[PDB]
Amino acid sequence: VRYSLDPENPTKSCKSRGSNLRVHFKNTRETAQAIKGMHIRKATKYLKDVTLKKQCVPFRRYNGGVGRCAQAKQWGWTQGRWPKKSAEFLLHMLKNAESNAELKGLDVDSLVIEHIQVNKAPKMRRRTYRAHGRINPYMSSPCHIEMILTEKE
Template structure:
C-alpha cells in the first residue's frame, strides 16, 4: 500500500509482529487487534507505553486499530492477487512485510495574532510478499 494515512510507528510494530506468520493467523490476529481483544507487542516505540496482559514476558503493547484495519485490507488484497496468480491460499505465509515512511502532507492551522502552526499528516508505505510454504 502506498501513502496510507496511518501511523508509521504503529505500522512498524504490527509488521514486526506478523512477519513470517501464516496468512490465516495474521488476518485473525489483526481482526482481534481491531476488536481490542489482543494487543500488539511493542519492541521499539515504547516511551510512555504501559505493559499489557497476555504476553509471556512483561512487555509494552497497544491496540492500533486504524493501522490494523488498513493492514488487514492490504493482506486480503494480497491474498486475492496470490489466488489470481494460481497460488494455494491455504498454504500462504508472509515472507516479507515492511513499513516505510511515506510523504508528509503539509498543512497549517491559523492561530491568534496572525500566527500559524504546522499541522502535518504522515503517510506510510507498506510492502508485502506472500509465498507458499
C-alpha cells in the same frame, strides 16, 4: 514496481503494495513486525483480535510513553497497544494479497508471509495555532506498505 526484496521463488510467491496510505507510520511498523512470521489465516485472525482488543500489538521501538497492558506478556514484552486503523489498512492488503495468489494459482491455506516493509510517505501539510500569534506544523505521517507472500507447506 521495483520491490525492496526479491523472492527466492517468483513462481511460488505473490506480492501486494500500498502507497501513500493515510495511517500513522509508527503504529504501522510495530504491527508489521508482529505480523511478519505467522501464517496468512493466522495473520487475519490476529488482526481481528487487535480490533476487538483481544490480542495486543507489542510496541518495541516507538514506545515512548506508550502504556503497558497485560496482553503483552504473550510476546515477551510489557508495553502493548491495539491500533485500529493500522491493523485495518493492512487487513485489506492481505485481502488484496489473497486475490493475487488465487489469480496466480497458489494455495491460499498454506501461504506464509516472509517480508513486510513500512516506508515513510511524504508528509501532508496542516497547521495548528499557538500562543502569541504563532503557527506550528501539524505534520501528518502516512506510510508505504509492501509485502510478499510465498507458498510453504
